[PDB]
Amino acid sequence: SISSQLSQWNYNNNRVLLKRSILKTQAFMDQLQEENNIRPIFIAANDEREKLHVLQLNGSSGSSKALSKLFHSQIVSVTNHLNALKKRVDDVSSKVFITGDVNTGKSALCNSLLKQRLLPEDQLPCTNVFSEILEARENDGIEEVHAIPLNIAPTLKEAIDMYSIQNPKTYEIHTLKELPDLVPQNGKYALLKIYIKDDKRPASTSLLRNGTVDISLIDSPGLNMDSLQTAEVMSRQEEIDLVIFVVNAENQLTLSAKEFISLASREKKLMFFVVKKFDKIRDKQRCKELILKQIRDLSPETYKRAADFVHFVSKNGDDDPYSSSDPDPDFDSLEDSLRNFVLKKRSLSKLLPAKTYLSKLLSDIIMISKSNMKNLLSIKFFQSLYEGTVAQKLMVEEINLDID
Template sequence: MSCYLPNTLATSYQDDLQAELQSSSDSGYGSVLDAHSEIPLATPATNSNSNHQSLLQQIRYNDNRARLARAIDGTATLLSNLKEHNDNVRPSHYPRCSRNQVIRGQSSFNEPESNRPNIRPAFSPLEDADQKSEFVDDALLVNSSVESDINVLKLDLRVEAHESESLHTLEAKSIGSLLSGRFTKSLRQLDALKTRIDDTSSKIFVTGDLNAGKSTFCNALLRKQVLPEDQQPCTNVFCEVLDARENGSVEEAHAVPHGISYSRLDERTYQTYPLEKLDDIVDDSINWAQVKVYVDDNRSIDQSLLRNGVVDIALIDAPGLNLDSLKTTAVFARQEEIDVVVFVVSAENHFTLSAKEFIWNAANEKAYIFIVVNRFDNIKAKERCRRLILEQIEKMSPQTFKDSSELVHFVSSNAVLDPFADPSKVVAFENLERSLRQFILVKRSKSKLAPAKTYLELLHRDIHTITSTNKGAAEKEYTKADQELSLVTPEYESTISTRNAVSDSALKIIEETCRSVQKYTRKHLQTCLRTMDTPICSYPGFLSAWHYAQQTQSMVLKKVEGQVLDCESFARSKTVSGVDAIRQLGLSSLKQYNPRQFNPHFMFSRRKDALERTISVCVQWSDFIDLDQQEKNGAIGMGVMAMTVIGGKFLSGKAILDGLLKIHGIGGHKLAGIGAVAFAISDLPRAIPKNVAKRVQKVLDSSDFIHNNSERIVRECRTVLNMPIEELRACFQSSIEEQARKKSELEKTKDESGTALRFYSRALKQSAEMGSIVGKIDLELD
């Protein structure tokens, strides 16, 4: 940017810049402007244009910082909504990776470089917005090409041979739980980013492999021997080097125990040691979590990094990456709290696998990493070494490689404090120092704001991918549920209608069957009772008249019983037809209908007693004489009366004849009596069946025999016919309940997927809008 102003205005701009830096808590400059620090003011004649540019740069910096802060707040709200929906509404789907691909967050440190997915820091919110994802049947996973774009929200699954649980085998709740953890971690990271961009200080994180020369590099920056150096690993505790002015200009070390939140004003949170004891403290990781080292750098503000006159600097010396797994994990976690990563790599060893892993992980936030290739003086083929290292950097951090002239330096840090060192080595380190100062103090948008922008870009890319995945899954699920519901609902309503119609038809079959059986039974038994007086056995003669009467009575009862059995047989036949008709209704109406076996022979099996044993009918003297013939022969009545008086039971025809003659003798009309007796004897074959049938009919009528039997038979038929209809109703009910359950599930699925579709559509739109805002923040104008 170029701007030319009259000299009369130069002083005004210079004053404005001074006021801006001193008064604004948002400036990022004013926290260390006190009696001990001052900005070197240029003369109006020479630097008015430069001062004006500095002021504009600061205004632009504050504007970008405010825009990033708003973007962080909006992103945190969106991410919280995604987490809330994932936790309490329905688990989110996650893009699928191929089965042999490792799903990485912080993965194993020995993974081949070829497996590392490409990280794309740039974000276009509308990119692939209309692209349709390919879904597997369970609608949980999409194609691997989409998954490879996940960076910040990539699930952290440690896949080990023969005992891994692949993403393909995880249930939706498990995937949702893993995503919830990533959402929570990103929310913490957003909060840390907000704190970092609001913080006026800058934290420089110096890390690298074991014995790469990290402590030597820090001492070279301080131009004094502060941190312990050794050929063996000597730094096991995080050492944070700060300006001694923050500690009352007293040089000392504050050792902070594990689990304690450090406060310089609260001496209970640390123990004080002189700097000479640092060798013992930094090696004691059992007692100390970190060490705050306050150092007095008396160099001028244009030379000192700690006392730079612009911002507070914290220089953090980290343990080596390969010291042990706990230390390595701590280094990975700590880098998320700092602004600038200075990665020290040995020129002799190049980048180890753990170094690559760290840079890959840091690339989720920091597109620019300051790389120091130390001990370069030990390399003979320097150009070859330079070329190989730059090729590795290009793959790991493209943006760093792009600005490698400013961000990648090949130096020998031990030469700075060596008075006999080759001056060219010192010059190389001074060039590194100027570039680092420029990166931290001048190009603050890159060092301070770029990590936040990079993280937001990658996060919104991940949100865009995940919301697109879930929108597509919800849309597919909604469409599928709606289509199935359009088929199930008519089927459900048809089944209910069919059940009612089949039930009515079955009831009609029962009523018609029972009505037919009842009509047949009543008519058949009535006909039987009307024709019982017909002789049904041969007459054995006068002398066996009594036996004939008994035999006639027994045969009459058996005839009636036979007719009852015939009615039952008819009812059984009609019931079989009715059962078959009802079953046919079920077979024609239901897809799954397996009726139970019906055995008609078990019908009427409860009636065990014979009719002649259940009806009390005994042969009487009145059964031998047809009283209707009294008018034809009056003496018969007298004989009957006399025999009634005499009483008793005669066992032979001779006895009957003698009795009749004696009766007539009493009356005095012997000839007339003989004739009447002769008539009575000759009428026995007709009189006995008639009288016996009449008396049996009278007994049956008095017991309502026809009605009771017809009701009994119909009741049995109705009971049997109700069994298949109840079975049919049960089948219909089961089918209706199953269809109702499926219909309810589809309605629930449709409602939930519709809600999810609307939610993810809004989230996708919001992420696209915020991603576009973040993408338009230009940090390249420093």
């Protein structure tokens, strides 16, 4: 159809423009890394309103060689993030990350979205290993679990990245119902690839076989369990396009939740907030007000669109209650907003994280440049960098993603 073809043509245009800005911005990062290597860069002391958005420098030239090394590792971190964004902008699929504190109902929500009791769901801490659900066409139609062993690479990210269906040395095969035995084994597995078919449902009601976009769901291990587990959730975030953040109604957004949201918000201006266990709350209106106020503070653009992105969903499994015909307008409304965001609003759902991150990073570089401008060799460098990064930020702000 016309409006579908129009979204595709707009999506391709925006993807071209963002890729171009990513490459230019990486060059500025490379230029800043070389300059700092020969003449360490002055870092100003920032109050809270003027704190940098992406370049996390705990230290300043007034109060803090060791500052130079923190800067270098900051640029490396940003470079890795820009590469991850560039991979995502070029990837046709949409990866959805379902995360939150332990025991908020993450796996129950994934079962809800898949309309079956597939992922282990339990009163006590359960999911210790990233569980990615994909349609089985990627695995030649075969429904099974590929369990990626930690011991195939030095780091979990590297184990994940060397997995190939074509190379059996990178995974163990297991049946779908071995999953309750697999998801606790974070001392053994980096990640579970869970391949399923959904052949009895039409594309209109099938999330994984929707017929226009390849989607995978990643069920996260919980926040606030272990330092290593939290660090892995923090870094998996930048390799995924969309976050669904799951909130326990009794606790609202805890400090561990806010630390994740605040880190993800460097690129994810928009994200879903799904509040579970609201059915248990006695003072429902006071609870709802608390949650909404925290979202306003942590994710103001999500708050403006709260009707599309904030949902209260009590569906859980503790005959299959996830494919039951019983009416559930709360879940139905979440499923509809998710499909609309992912399938129809691709420029926003896929590409807004790239624009948001570039905008904030260019801002930071603009601030550093202004701070480092009147050796005189260094003066000319920061004048060129100021003028170039200013122009690039204006170009990124030109890119209009709200065209669907």
